[PDB]
Design an enzyme around this catalytic site. Structure first.
Site, PDB file in Angstrom:
ATOM      1  N   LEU A  76      18.234  72.455   5.815  1.00  0.00           N
ATOM      2  CA  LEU A  76      17.084  72.978   6.513  1.00  0.00           C
ATOM      3  C   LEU A  76      16.630  74.203   5.789  1.00  0.00           C
ATOM      4  O   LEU A  76      17.432  75.146   5.618  1.00  0.00           O
ATOM      5  CB  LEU A  76      17.492  73.417   7.905  1.00  0.00           C
ATOM      6  CG  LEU A  76      17.942  72.285   8.809  1.00  0.00           C
ATOM      7  CD1 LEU A  76      18.236  72.824  10.149  1.00  0.00           C
ATOM      8  CD2 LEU A  76      16.859  71.222   8.898  1.00  0.00           C
TER       9      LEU A  76
ATOM     10  N   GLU B 148      15.861  77.738  17.787  1.00  0.00           N
ATOM     11  CA  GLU B 148      15.371  76.420  17.497  1.00  0.00           C
ATOM     12  C   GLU B 148      16.526  75.414  17.599  1.00  0.00           C
ATOM     13  O   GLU B 148      16.442  74.445  18.368  1.00  0.00           O
ATOM     14  CB  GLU B 148      14.698  76.400  16.132  1.00  0.00           C
ATOM     15  CG  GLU B 148      13.601  75.312  15.969  1.00  0.00           C
ATOM     16  CD  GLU B 148      14.123  73.882  16.094  1.00  0.00           C
ATOM     17  OE1 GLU B 148      15.155  73.542  15.453  1.00  0.00           O
ATOM     18  OE2 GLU B 148      13.469  73.071  16.781  1.00  0.00           O
TER      19      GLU B 148
HETATM   20  N1  LIG Z   1      13.829  69.763   9.887  1.00  0.00           N
HETATM   21  C1  LIG Z   1      14.341  68.799  10.692  1.00  0.00           C
HETATM   22  O1  LIG Z   1      14.055  68.624  11.876  1.00  0.00           O
HETATM   23  C2  LIG Z   1      15.390  67.905  10.052  1.00  0.00           C
HETATM   24  C3  LIG Z   1      15.484  67.802   8.677  1.00  0.00           C
HETATM   25  N2  LIG Z   1      16.473  66.986   8.086  1.00  0.00           N
HETATM   26  C4  LIG Z   1      16.509  66.990   6.593  1.00  0.00           C
HETATM   27  O2  LIG Z   1      15.987  65.765   6.021  1.00  0.00           O
HETATM   28  C5  LIG Z   1      16.762  65.584   4.730  1.00  0.00           C
HETATM   29  C6  LIG Z   1      17.419  64.188   4.774  1.00  0.00           C
HETATM   30  O3  LIG Z   1      16.360  63.201   4.751  1.00  0.00           O
HETATM   31  P1  LIG Z   1      16.617  61.945   3.839  1.00  0.00           P
HETATM   32  O4  LIG Z   1      17.108  62.452   2.530  1.00  0.00           O
HETATM   33  O5  LIG Z   1      15.539  60.912   3.838  1.00  0.00           O
HETATM   34  O6  LIG Z   1      17.947  61.263   4.406  1.00  0.00           O
HETATM   35  P2  LIG Z   1      18.395  60.655   5.817  1.00  0.00           P
HETATM   36  O7  LIG Z   1      19.066  61.682   6.677  1.00  0.00           O
HETATM   37  O8  LIG Z   1      17.380  59.697   6.410  1.00  0.00           O
HETATM   38  O9  LIG Z   1      19.583  59.781   5.209  1.00  0.00           O
HETATM   39  C7  LIG Z   1      19.167  58.834   4.172  1.00  0.00           C
HETATM   40  C8  LIG Z   1      20.169  57.759   4.200  1.00  0.00           C
HETATM   41  O10 LIG Z   1      20.385  57.356   5.620  1.00  0.00           O
HETATM   42  C9  LIG Z   1      20.623  55.954   5.585  1.00  0.00           C
HETATM   43  N3  LIG Z   1      19.314  55.336   6.106  1.00  0.00           N
HETATM   44  C10 LIG Z   1      18.236  56.049   6.517  1.00  0.00           C
HETATM   45  N4  LIG Z   1      17.292  55.221   6.971  1.00  0.00           N
HETATM   46  C11 LIG Z   1      17.747  53.981   6.894  1.00  0.00           C
HETATM   47  C12 LIG Z   1      17.207  52.727   7.223  1.00  0.00           C
HETATM   48  N5  LIG Z   1      15.955  52.564   7.741  1.00  0.00           N
HETATM   49  N6  LIG Z   1      17.974  51.648   7.012  1.00  0.00           N
HETATM   50  C13 LIG Z   1      19.198  51.736   6.497  1.00  0.00           C
HETATM   51  N7  LIG Z   1      19.741  52.907   6.184  1.00  0.00           N
HETATM   52  C14 LIG Z   1      19.033  54.052   6.344  1.00  0.00           C
HETATM   53  C15 LIG Z   1      21.137  55.951   4.127  1.00  0.00           C
HETATM   54  O11 LIG Z   1      21.710  54.758   3.733  1.00  0.00           O
HETATM   55  P3  LIG Z   1      22.921  54.737   2.634  1.00  0.00           P
HETATM   56  O12 LIG Z   1      24.342  54.858   3.286  1.00  0.00           O
HETATM   57  O13 LIG Z   1      22.656  53.497   1.848  1.00  0.00           O
HETATM   58  O14 LIG Z   1      22.744  56.092   1.778  1.00  0.00           O
HETATM   59  C16 LIG Z   1      19.888  56.439   3.439  1.00  0.00           C
HETATM   60  O15 LIG Z   1      20.081  56.670   2.038  1.00  0.00           O
HETATM   61  C17 LIG Z   1      17.817  66.736   4.620  1.00  0.00           C
HETATM   62  O16 LIG Z   1      17.269  67.850   3.889  1.00  0.00           O
HETATM   63  C18 LIG Z   1      17.962  67.201   6.053  1.00  0.00           C
HETATM   64  O17 LIG Z   1      18.383  68.597   6.079  1.00  0.00           O
HETATM   65  C19 LIG Z   1      17.331  66.220   8.844  1.00  0.00           C
HETATM   66  C20 LIG Z   1      17.213  66.344  10.224  1.00  0.00           C
HETATM   67  C21 LIG Z   1      16.262  67.155  10.825  1.00  0.00           C
HETATM   68  C1  LIG Z   2      19.890  69.268   8.596  1.00  0.00           C
HETATM   69  O1  LIG Z   2      20.307  69.192  10.006  1.00  0.00           O
HETATM   70  C2  LIG Z   2      21.080  70.272  10.434  1.00  0.00           C
HETATM   71  C3  LIG Z   2      21.580  71.239   9.570  1.00  0.00           C
HETATM   72  C4  LIG Z   2      22.329  72.279  10.096  1.00  0.00           C
HETATM   73  C5  LIG Z   2      22.588  72.362  11.451  1.00  0.00           C
HETATM   74  O2  LIG Z   2      23.326  73.420  11.899  1.00  0.00           O
HETATM   75  C6  LIG Z   2      24.310  73.009  12.902  1.00  0.00           C
HETATM   76  C7  LIG Z   2      23.867  73.171  14.350  1.00  0.00           C
HETATM   77  C8  LIG Z   2      24.717  72.236  15.212  1.00  0.00           C
HETATM   78  C9  LIG Z   2      25.027  72.934  16.516  1.00  0.00           C
HETATM   79  C10 LIG Z   2      24.007  72.487  17.563  1.00  0.00           C
HETATM   80  C11 LIG Z   2      24.368  71.136  18.254  1.00  0.00           C
HETATM   81  O3  LIG Z   2      25.539  70.943  18.686  1.00  0.00           O
HETATM   82  O4  LIG Z   2      23.420  70.386  18.402  1.00  0.00           O
HETATM   83  C12 LIG Z   2      22.078  71.394  12.330  1.00  0.00           C
HETATM   84  C13 LIG Z   2      21.331  70.354  11.782  1.00  0.00           C
HETATM   85  C14 LIG Z   2      20.764  69.305  12.673  1.00  0.00           C
HETATM   86  C15 LIG Z   2      19.397  69.744  13.262  1.00  0.00           C
HETATM   87  C16 LIG Z   2      19.052  71.103  13.458  1.00  0.00           C
HETATM   88  N1  LIG Z   2      17.881  71.473  13.971  1.00  0.00           N
HETATM   89  C17 LIG Z   2      16.999  70.537  14.354  1.00  0.00           C
HETATM   90  N2  LIG Z   2      15.864  70.940  14.904  1.00  0.00           N
HETATM   91  C18 LIG Z   2      14.947  70.058  15.296  1.00  0.00           C
HETATM   92  N3  LIG Z   2      13.813  70.509  15.845  1.00  0.00           N
HETATM   93  N4  LIG Z   2      15.141  68.730  15.107  1.00  0.00           N
HETATM   94  C19 LIG Z   2      16.243  68.232  14.587  1.00  0.00           C
HETATM   95  N5  LIG Z   2      16.333  66.907  14.466  1.00  0.00           N
HETATM   96  C20 LIG Z   2      17.250  69.154  14.190  1.00  0.00           C
HETATM   97  C21 LIG Z   2      18.483  68.772  13.628  1.00  0.00           C
HETATM   98  C22 LIG Z   2      18.908  67.334  13.369  1.00  0.00           C
END
Ligand SMILES: NC(=O)C1=CN([C@@H]2O[C@H](COP(=O)(O)OP(=O)(O)OC[C@H]3O[C@@H](n4cnc5c(N)ncnc54)[C@@H](OP(=O)(O)O)[C@@H]3O)[C@@H](O)[C@H]2O)C=CC1
Ligand SMILES: COc1ccc(OCCCCCC(=O)O)cc1Cc1cnc2nc(N)nc(N)c2c1C
Length: 206
Positions: A25, A32
Site C-alpha cells: 500500500l 483507514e
Molecule cells: N489499496 C487497496 O485497497 C488494496 C491494494 N492492494 C494492492 O494490490 C496489489 C496486488 O494486486 P495484484 O498484483 O493484481 O495481485 P492480486 O492480489 O490480485 O493477486 C494476483 C494473484 O492472485 C491470484 N488471482 C487473482 N485473480 C485471479 C483470478 N481471477 N483467477 C485466478 N487466480 C487469480 C494469483 O494467481 P497465482 O497463484 O497463479 O499467482 C494471481 O497472480 C498489491 O500492491 C497490494 O498491496 C491489495 C488490496 C487492497
Molecule cells: C496490501 O494490503 C494490506 C497491506 C497491509 C496491511 O496492514 C495490516 C492491517 C491488518 C490489520 C487489520 C485487520 O485485521 O483487518 C493490510 C492490508 C490489507 C488492506 C488494508 N487496507 C485496506 N483498505 C481498504 N480500503 N480496502 C482494502 N481492501 C484494504 C486491505 C485489503
C-alpha cells in the site's frame, strides 16, 4: 445453490485509481485500516452468534499482508490462486477462481455447519478486482478515495467514479453507508499523515 449472495468489493484508491506500489500500500493509514477491519468484520448482533463474514483475496495480496496479521482475524479467509497450493498448507482456504471460492464456501459452510457466512467481500488484488468487476453478483464498492496522486504501479481496473460509468455505478448517501456498515462513519475529508481521504459507498443494479 450458488447465486444467493451479492459480492461487495472494498478498496482504497487515489483519484487516478492507484491502489498499490511494491506489492504494498502506497500509504500508511491507521484509521483507514481500522475502517477496513470494522467493515469487513461487522455482523449484525442477532447473527453474531453463528455468522462470520468472508474475505476473498488474490495471492499477491495474501503475501503482501504483514505475516502477523494473517489470516485476517474473525473473518473466513480465502486466497484465490491457480496453484494448487502449497499455500503453505496449512488450513487457509484456497481456490482458483472467484466462482470456485464461492462453491467451496457453500459446500464448507452449509445449513448444517457450525459457522454461517454473513457477507462476502473481495478485498483485493487488482487482478481479483478485475474478475470481481466482471462478476454478475458484484453490486457494491466500499471505496476510500485518497485525494492525492501518490505514485502507484498497480491500478484499479475500472473507472467506476468517472462519467463513462455513471449510469451503472451510483454513489450512495452517507446515511445509507452508515446504515449498511452498521456504524456511524466519518463524513467528509479525513487527514492522517499528510493527505485527505474519504469513505464512499457505490452501487449498481444486478
Ligand atoms: N489499496 C487497496 O485497497 C488494496 C491494494 N492492494 C494492492 O494490490 C496489489 C496486488 O494486486 P495484484 O498484483 O493484481 O495481485 P492480486 O492480489 O490480485 O493477486 C494476483 C494473484 O492472485 C491470484 N488471482 C487473482 N485473480 C485471479 C483470478 N481471477 N483467477 C485466478 N487466480 C487469480 C494469483 O494467481 P497465482 O497463484 O497463479 O499467482 C494471481 O497472480 C498489491 O500492491 C497490494 O498491496 C491489495 C488490496 C487492497
Ligand atoms: C496490501 O494490503 C494490506 C497491506 C497491509 C496491511 O496492514 C495490516 C492491517 C491488518 C490489520 C487489520 C485487520 O485485521 O483487518 C493490510 C492490508 C490489507 C488492506 C488494508 N487496507 C485496506 N483498505 C481498504 N480500503 N480496502 C482494502 N481492501 C484494504 C486491505 C485489503
Amino acid at each position: 445453490m450458488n447465486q444467493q449472495k451479492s459480492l461487495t468489493l472494498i478498496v482504497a484508491l487515489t483519484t487516478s485509481y492507484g491502489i498499490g506500489r511494491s506489492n504494498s500500500l502506497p500509504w500508511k493509514l491507521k484509521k483507514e485500516i481500522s475502517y477496513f477491519k470494522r467493515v469487513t468484520s461487522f455482523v449484525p448482533t442477532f447473527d453474531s452468534f453463528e455468522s462470520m463474514n468472508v474475505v476473498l483475496m488474490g495471492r499477491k495480496t495474501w503475501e503482501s499482508i504483514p505475516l502477523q496479521f494473517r489470516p485476517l482475524k474473525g473473518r473466513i479467509n480465502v486466497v484465490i490462486t491457480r496453484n494448487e497450493s502449497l499455500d503453505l498448507g496449512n488450513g487457509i482456504h484456497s481456490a482458483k477462481s472467484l466462482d470456485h471460492a464461492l462453491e467451496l464456501l457453500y459446500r464448507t459452510y452449509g445449513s448444517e455447519s457450525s459457522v454461517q457466512i454473513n457477507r462476502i467481500f473481495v478485498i483485493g488484488g487488482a487482478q481479483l478486482y478485475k474478475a470481481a468487476m466482471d462478476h454478475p453478483k458484484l453490486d457494491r464498492i466500499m471505496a476510500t478515495i485518497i485525494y492525492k496522486d501518490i505514485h502507484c504501479d498497480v491500478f484499479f481496473p475500472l473507472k467506476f467514479r468517472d462519467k463513462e460509468w455513471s449510469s451503472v455505478w451510483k454513489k450512495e448517501k452517507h446515511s445509507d453507508l452508515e446504515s449498511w456498515v452498521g456504524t456511524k462513519v466519518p463524513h467528509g475529508k479525513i487527514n492522517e499523515d499528510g493527505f485527505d481521504y474519504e469513505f464512499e459507498m457505490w452501487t449498481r443494479d444486478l
